[PDB]
Each structure stands twice: as structure tokens, then as C-alpha cells.
């Protein structure tokens, strides 16, 4: 259990492989995150969403913003794509737990300059993959 906590070290390795914070190791790390997310799902998505919230709140002044944020948002979002399409298919209810922590970053994404447009497609695909299960939470909010 507590030796199996290596998944958090995998999350931290994914942080060190972020462009804002060897590429074969990044590919193997991403593939392992997707492979773990089939069986153990909540820890992987919780870690990745803490990552995306952190990437949202850092480093605005540099050009490192407009290039590394631009790449890293696609990296986090397509890992979320392959995680949600890795067939969890169980509710594990989490209606106000983590999905509420999902949707405010999501409307932070597609609430509203040149770099935004293809991020909107990836966020829309993320919502498309996400709303295959638990329609009731977003229905109650809407």
C-alpha cells in the first residue's frame, strides 16, 4: 500500500518532464499513467488535475508562458483524453468531490488569444469523453 505509493513519484516524474518545469522516458511515463489509470483511476486523475491547476497558476510573465503553457496544456489534456477513454466505466460517485474541481478549470479553458483556439477543441473533446458517465452533475449545474 504505502510502498505502492510510487504512483505519486510517477506523478512527480511527470512534473519534471513538463516543458514548463529524455523524451522516450516522457513517452513511457505517459503510457504508464494511462496503463495505471485503467485499474487505479482516482489517484491518477487527482494527481493530474492538481498538475493542471498548478500549470494554470504559474509563470505568466515570460515567453515560457506562451510556449510551455501551450505545449503542456495539450500534454495534460491528451493524457486526460487517454485516461478517460481507458474504460473506467464506474461512477465512484465523486459528484461534488472532484468533478466540481474539474468544471471550473474547464470553464476557465472554454469560457472565452491566438493560442486559445486549438485548446478549445481539446477541452471540448475532454468534456465529450468525460460526459459518457456522470451526466447528472453537469445537468444539475446547467
Amino acid at each position: 500500500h504505502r510502498p505502492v505509493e510510487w504512483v505519486q513519484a510517477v506523478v512527480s516524474r511527470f512534473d519534471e518532464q513538463l516543458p514548463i518545469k529524455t523524451k522516450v522516458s516522457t513517452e513511457h511515463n505517459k503510457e504508464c499513467l494511462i496503463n495505471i489509470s485503467k485499474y487505479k483511476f482516482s489517484l491518477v486523475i487527482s494527481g493530474l488535475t492538481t498538475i493542471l491547476k498548478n500549470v494554470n497558476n504559474m509563470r505568466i510573465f515570460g515567453e515560457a508562458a506562451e510556449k510551455n503553457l501551450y505545449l503542456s496544456q495539450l500534454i495534460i489534456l491528451d493524457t486526460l483524453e487517454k485516461c478517460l477513454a481507458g474504460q473506467p466505466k464506474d461512477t465512484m460517485r465523486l459528484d461534488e468531490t472532484m468533478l466540481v474541481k474539474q468544471l471550473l478549470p474547464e470553464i476557465c479553458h472554454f469560457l472565452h488569444n491566438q493560442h486559445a483556439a486549438e485548446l478549445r477543441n481539446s477541452a471540448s473533446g475532454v468534456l465529450f469523453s468525460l460526459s459518457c458517465n456522470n451526466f447528472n452533475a453537469v445537468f444539475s449545474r446547467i
Binding site: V4, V24, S25, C32, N35, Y39
Partner: protein, 216 residues
């Protein structure tokens, strides 16, 4: 001779053949490579004799000859030849001890392949040694950059996280149960304290036993 097996933690009565291998495991940690060559010569000569007990079983896997092959795989794992819970745990401890102290990358990879094979093959006894390589795997996942090295590590992690959901029927303390605790203690590096330990006092009585039975 009961009392020394309590302190060194290797019981000859529990398993002779694995305990002699566990005694010879510190020969790989010798500073002299000639001693290592003598150690593997001992392992080969013991292998020839334990296969000479059987009929023409030299370099084929059977239970009375598994452990030497473990000690020889640095320089398979059939479930039906042995069918025993203790022997899988003992061989897995032997492999993990051969992992933790060696720093050779080729030996690390050739042991991680057999280890990830054993993770899929034997999930029921795999949480026994799990804390022993917990010290290695945490650094390996964070720092190492060789995909050939990490792929058996990755397979080990996927095998552990898939089969974690069962309660541990064989945990880490199971080694303490049948009197073979501290195999990692004996196979470690030399202490360089150059101090004789306490239990050697008991060994003194061991020697003064033997004389009283053997000259007259």
C-alpha cells in the same frame, strides 16, 4: 546449533539448500574478484552434485536444484515443477537480494526481466519482497533514463497495481514465520567495522561441542 540459526536467521533445518546459497551470497560482495570466481566455482560444483543425486538432471530445473540456478542467473520459473508456496518466496527473496546490492546495469536489467516475469507469474507471493525493492524502485522511476531498464520496472509497477486489491495472504513478515528472516542481512556488503559480532560467542560453544563428540 539451534541457537546460531536464530541469530544469523538462516535455518538449515527449514531448508538446507537455500540456506547454503544464502551463506554464499556474500561472496559476490567481496572486494576481490578472485573470491567471486571461487564462489561461482562452489556454486557450479554444488550444482553438479545435487544433479548427480538425481539421474542426469544437470542444468534442468528441479526443486533440489532451483536455488543455485538463481545464484547462477546473474552470471524458466515453471509453476508446475515445484508447486510450493515457500519455494517461490525463497527464490524471490534470493533474486531481490541479488538486485538490491549489485550496481551493474546489465545485471540489473537481466534481473529485472526475470523479476517482471515473476510478478506476472507469481502475484500471490509478490508482496513478500515488495518493501525490499521499494528502496530501489522509487529512485529508478524518478531518475533513470534507459527505456530498456524501465520497461521491466514499468511491468512490475503495472503488475503490482493490478493485483494489489487482494489482502496480503503472504506479507513481509512471512519470512520471519518459518525461520529464514534476515537473508538480506547476510547477503549485504561487508560492514568495514572489522568487529567480531556477539553470536560468535555461541559459536565458541559450538566448537567446544564438536571436539567432545569426535576425538574419543
Amino acid at each position: 546449533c539451534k541457537q546460531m540459526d536464530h541469530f544469523v536467521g538462516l535455518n538449515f533445518n527449514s531448508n538446507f539448500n537455500f540456506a547454503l546459497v544464502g551463506h554464499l551470497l556474500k561472496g559476490y560482495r567481496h572486494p576481490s574478484p578472485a573470491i567471486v570466481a571461487r564462489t561461482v566455482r562452489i556454486l557450479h560444483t554444488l550444482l553438479t552434485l545435487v544433479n548427480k543425486h538425481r539421474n542426469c538432471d544437470k542444468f534442468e530445473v528441479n526443486t533440489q536444484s532451483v536455488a543455485y540456478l538463481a545464484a547462477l542467473l546473474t552470471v524458466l520459473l515453471d509453476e508446475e515443477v515445484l508447486t510450493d508456496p515457500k519455494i517461490q518466496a525463497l527464490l524471490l527473496t534470493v533474486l531481490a537480494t541479488l538486485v538490491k546490492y549489485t550496481t551493474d546495469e546489465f545485471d540489473q536489467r537481466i534481473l529485472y526481466e526475470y523479476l517482471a516475469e515473476a510478478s506476472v507469474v507469481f502475484p500471490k507471493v509478490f508482496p513478500v519482497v515488495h518493501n525490499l525493492l521499494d528502496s530501489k524502485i522509487n529512485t529508478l522511476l524518478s531518475l533513470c533514463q534507459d527505456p530498456n531498464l524501465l520497461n521491466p520496472i514499468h511491468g512490475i509497477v503495472q503488475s503490482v497495481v493490478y493485483h494489489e486489491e487482494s489482502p496480503p495472504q503472504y506479507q513481509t513478515s512471512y519470512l520471519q514465520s518459518f525461520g529464514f528472516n534476515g537473508l538480506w542481512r547476510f547477503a549485504g556488503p561487508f560492514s568495514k567495522q572489522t568487529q567480531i559480532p556477539d553470536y560468535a560467542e555461541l559459536i565458541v560453544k559450538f566448537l567446544d561441542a564438536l571436539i567432545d563428540t569426535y576425538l574419543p
